[PDB]
Design a protein around this ligand. Structure first.
Ligand code: CA
Length: 279
């Protein structure tokens, strides 16, 4: 399949070169997979989700995304126009309030929720979780992310936007999950992107167009935007039978565009998520 005039990040993920604008992907498009977006929620009524999104959990007075950030991330995972895996099922878990904040205890509860909740969902091709959030180092937060991964979920987490070594942030610093840095349309490390040994992969993170609340669309930047590209990619690859939850991060790294990013600090992987789709 070919989507012309796609957001640059989608085009990037199916290309051996920067500077193109068509997204190429296998028509299966993540059908039969599921992606949990653990964030401020998802506006499920957005036409871009085509009925494939639903809220499954909140820790607040409402499951509504009153912020937009969760809706944007969900859009990059799986919206019809702005998404990597255009036929995946999206499940929203609202661990962040409408200000985009959340106590670590609530975030941890949300991760353990997903590990159980997948047993209540139909995801024959596999399960992914996208965590576009984080804070300072916490062994408890890392351990929760590790449990989620261990339970059979491909966990993708944001590296963070501190232009610093991600070893000092959680869940970014958890070794067993897939930690995602951000790049721009010119294959530069995004200026805010964290880096370091704990990073596993980079994805498009600067100036990313996706869904927003009120049935709208929006371009924003962050490792929060890179993460759902990788989560959607994992779901897409799992539907193709190319990988599994336990090995998707490794597979994505194995098959990534290598050595093509600029301003990657010595000791950080120079790997850019790539679907290796040959039309
Ligand atoms: Ca790893």
């Amino acid at each position: 399949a070919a989507q012309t005039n796609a957001p640059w990040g989608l085009a990037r993920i199916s290309s051996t070169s920067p500077g193109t604008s068509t997204y190429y992907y296998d028509e299966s498009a993540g059908q039969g997979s599921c992606v949990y977006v653990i964030d401020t929620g998802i506006e499920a009524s957005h036409p871009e989700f085509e009925g494939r999104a639903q809220m499954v959990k909140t820790y607040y007075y409402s499951s509504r995304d009153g912020n937009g950030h969760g809706t944007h991330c969900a859009g990059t995972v799986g919206s019809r126009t702005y998404g990597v895996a255009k036929k995946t099922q999206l499940f929203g878990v609202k661990v962040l309030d409408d200000n985009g904040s959340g106590q670590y205890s609530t975030i941890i509860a949300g991760m353990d929720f997903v590990a159980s909740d997948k047993n209540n969902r139909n995801c024959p091709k596999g399960v992914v979780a996208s965590l576009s959030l984080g804070g300072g180092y916490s062994s408890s937060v890392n351990s929760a992310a590790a449990r989620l991964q261990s339970s059979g979920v491909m966990v993708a987490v944001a590296a963070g936007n501190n232009n610093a070594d991600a070893r000092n942030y959680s869940p970014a610093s958890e070794p067993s999950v897939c930690t995602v840095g951000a790049s721009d349309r010119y294959d530069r490390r995004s200026s805010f992107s964290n880096y370091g040994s704990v990073l596993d992969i980079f994805g498009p993170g600067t100036s990313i167009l996706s869904t927003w609340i009120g049935g709208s669309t929006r371009s924003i930047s962050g490792t929060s935007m890179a993460t759902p590209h990788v989560a959607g990619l994992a779901a897409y690859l799992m539907t193709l039978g190319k990988t599994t939850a336990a090995s998707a991060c490794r597979y994505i790294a194995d098959t990534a565009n290598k050595g093509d990013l600029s301003n990657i600090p010595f000791g950080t992987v120079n790997l850019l998520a790539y679907n290796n789709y040959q039309a």
